[PDB]
Design a protein around this ligand. Sequence first.
Ligand SMILES: NC1CCN(C[C@@H](O)COc2cccc(C(F)(F)F)c2)CC1
Lengths: 1034, 50, 50
Amino acid sequence: MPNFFIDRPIFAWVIAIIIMLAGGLAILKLPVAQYPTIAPPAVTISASYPGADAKTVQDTVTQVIEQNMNGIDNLMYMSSNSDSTGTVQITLTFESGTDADIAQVQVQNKLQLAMPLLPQEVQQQGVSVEKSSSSFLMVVGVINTDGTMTQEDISDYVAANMKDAISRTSGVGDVQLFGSQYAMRIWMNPNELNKFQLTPVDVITAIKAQNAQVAAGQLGGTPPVKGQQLNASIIAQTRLTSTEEFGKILLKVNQDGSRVLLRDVAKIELGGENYDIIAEFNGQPASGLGIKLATGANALDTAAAIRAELAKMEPFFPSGLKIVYPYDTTPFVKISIHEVVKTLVEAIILVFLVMYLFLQNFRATLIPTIAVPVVLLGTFAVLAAFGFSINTLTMFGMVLAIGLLVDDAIVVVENVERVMAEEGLPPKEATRKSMGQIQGALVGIAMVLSAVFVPMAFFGGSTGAIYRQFSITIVSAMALSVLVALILTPALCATMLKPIAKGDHGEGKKGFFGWFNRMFEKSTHHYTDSVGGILRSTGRYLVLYLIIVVGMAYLFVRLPSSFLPDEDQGVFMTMVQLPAGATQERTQKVLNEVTHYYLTKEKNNVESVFAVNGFGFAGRGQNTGIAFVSLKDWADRPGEENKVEAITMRATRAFSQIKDAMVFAFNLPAIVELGTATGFDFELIDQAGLGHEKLTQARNQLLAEAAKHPDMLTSVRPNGLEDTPQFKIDIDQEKAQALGVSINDINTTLGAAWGGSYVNDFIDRGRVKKVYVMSEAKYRMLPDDIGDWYVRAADGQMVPFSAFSSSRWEYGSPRLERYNGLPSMEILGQAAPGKSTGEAMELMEQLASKLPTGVGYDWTGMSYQERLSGNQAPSLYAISLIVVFLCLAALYESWSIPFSVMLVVPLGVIGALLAATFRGLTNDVYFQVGLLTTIGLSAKNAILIVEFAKDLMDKEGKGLIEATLDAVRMRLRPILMTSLAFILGVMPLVISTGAGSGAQNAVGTGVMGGMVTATVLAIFFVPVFFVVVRRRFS
Amino acid sequence: GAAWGGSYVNDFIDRGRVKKVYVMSEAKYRMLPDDIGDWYVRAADGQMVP
Amino acid sequence: ATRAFSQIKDAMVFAFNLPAIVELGTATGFDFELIDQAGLGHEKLTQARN
Ligand SMILES: NC1CCN(C[C@@H](O)COc2cccc(C(F)(F)F)c2)CC1
């Protein structure tokens, strides 16, 4: 193939043009997102049963739905929570590769058949099935700076005017309203209700009767009379529209002739559907829209479109309404992608500079400057073809593959240059000879790097999905680089390079270039002499190689493991957890202290604080809250002390002094779609119907036992809420019957007054809005207020609740958990420093085995993935190693020579490990992919060295030592210049400290160390391996 | 609703097939707007209110 | 077993192995449907089947 395209440079140029056009089309049409789909597909069912405790929701909703989640394909597991707020939340997790649309449709279809079995109130509120495996692209908050609009007003305005147009913006996949539309609130007064001889049941009945849509008919409708000429539709009673209309609702007319309206026994207003959650932006009332990106959409373009739509909206807003962006991580994505692109461009420029320094030829330097961009564009085309997107993983994989790309280009051009400078042949004949020398090596290298990189695509789980991005990117880049080195680079060398004299290698030049040429010639002579001396005493260096291998193993075992570096994305979170029974006001006060601290003690770093009172993480209630702190631009936060880690540490230290509250500040995970660390998530299952109390006792026993092992298990805690006091109303139905009070009336009165009851809809400004009846807040606060509520009897006489019911205080769970349809309790923990996750999981299994009868356990979350993909690596790499050996044996036509090449892995691995250890970095994904890239480059260099040596030994009569020395002399320059180019290209990643510096350092430090030690060691260890192998096996 | 727009009550069986049952006014009593006064509703005391 | 289960005289008892593929059934068997396509009724369909 190289000879074919040397006579046909225009055909090679046509192929290159096709590749570039395909790459450009892909670049214009590729999606862009921070990360790809990593989490396994999950479908989440949400239902609300207002006014209900955890047990009521669990027994009436959660269990009924869970007993019908059958016949759904590809389900890994299922979990559910039932909260004291009246909400059930069921998550069904499916294996990776499952079609999320099909999983969702199956789940909702099974729920549609389960729907008739649920309470009528749950059916009225609706059960929603969504995809919870994704996260918010953006959060657009709406605030009022005048105080004229409360939170409900802002929420209703956003719902009516903003949600539709934002949803219609291009690329927007989903919009969730941080709030709700208006609701007709009927705040009942029990005293007035008793005065006018009424109860909440009467109010609901009247509202339902006098606010409804009635089908009337049609004038002159078919079948008509034989002479009808007019046909018109008849309109009749329609839904109410104004608070005044609801106030005029008639409940009863008294005997004396007075009229009792709804306004007489209650206040009528436009409130919110729910009041559980209060959102504030820097202390001001706020609503919001959470925008999820559509599938296949460009995140940057979608964010820009959203901002443009909001800017268009701005003029029409009511005075004092403003738009803010509390959670804007798109700037982080933009700066990260820009840094990667800049790294690629600077790498190409550095390749040009190194080529000019070493070869002092302008056209030779131009040749790689054409070759590498063609390969990159082809790689973009290949990513687009297989439905990949431009994300952090793929872009960093491209950064890593730059080393192999530049190595291929440098190898081809430098070999042609050397053939010209030694044999004195013209460019065309020299290119023919060079490619005849190196083409088989290039093909074998392509196969070997395929063997090295493909196995990562076959890892399982979220980690496997992460690794597949790098695998596909690097494999495509390597294959395209080899194809270019076989097609275009020979043609460019044959057509562009100028002739060089037989004996000219830059000695006669003057100045810095002449000095550099003389110095490099002397260094080559010295290195050749040193290698020749080394080959006389190979045993000592074999012992040294064993020492290096032992040190490599030591460093590998002593290096901690991780998944992804934690990044300073310009935002972080602060959870507030108050003691059981804390009300909304106490949590609001604590959140106010947190906001004050962030806006005063960190005013130079924090831009805004979005405090949400009503739900934290792992729960939702009046005692929980979460604040999303946004930081200023990184340019305005210089130094380590002003980054997210330092700010979070200082904030946690400051908040530790807060009393009667656990306030904890922390940073986002690398991929927010997964909450993952070097820890375990553990489920304790009630396998025999023991009950909640026995399961709590078993959990306490397990927690104590785990705490008795501080050396292996750290911070083993429950992921749930402890039992809290509850107010039990024990109704004596015998008394109710004796007093002529229907228990249905008693229960309806209690629920409507204290829990709130949804009655029906009404049309406000052309939109359906719910009508809620609830007791006015004054009369449903304390237990004594129970005495303010009366119920009519069959005799017409009111009876108080104290007359037919007693009260007391008990203990109950505010949050009931189920796993795989059985009662469960979740425990989070992490292995102690120096201990692997597997050891902690084994110890937890052992401790669980000593638990009461009928208590089982399971692993869920990341622990499930660990338990599936536990031993898959070493097998996948034993297959890779075998395939590499087979490819090398095919290439060299020898069963023993492959070992001389294969013995080079530790040379780069040791350097990568040392660089990671000194810098303190962990054994994370980026480090592992960089390690594989270093191994690939080292193997490529060793393959070329051994190929040259064996070619000299076979095609010429040169001996083993002479051939080895000549081969290393020939290969020294390309190795050194490629290593220099790649090291200088990755310097910015190593030294970076700004946005995205975590991933940059993780990628760059290992690459730097591995490349440095590989270049230093291989150049005199590969000859030793080759000589030893040929002596022992010949 | 039943008089002017028709009300579907329940199902019956015609020649072995399930079919609908509709109650509706005769055409002559639901053609003109003046026919509304021809329709009465029973009161709790038994009197027919137009 | 089938031969033995003929003196019972109380029920039809029939022991049988499964085919290689359950759905395919016996290579010489046929399944036939007599449809009531005119609303005849159950009794007339029974008479036709008889
Ligand atoms: N009825 C409404 C009342 C208002 N709030 C709004 C809060 O949910 C917004 O807070 C956020 C902000 C950003 C991200 C998230 C994430 F964690 F969900 F991703 C939550 C919800 C219920």
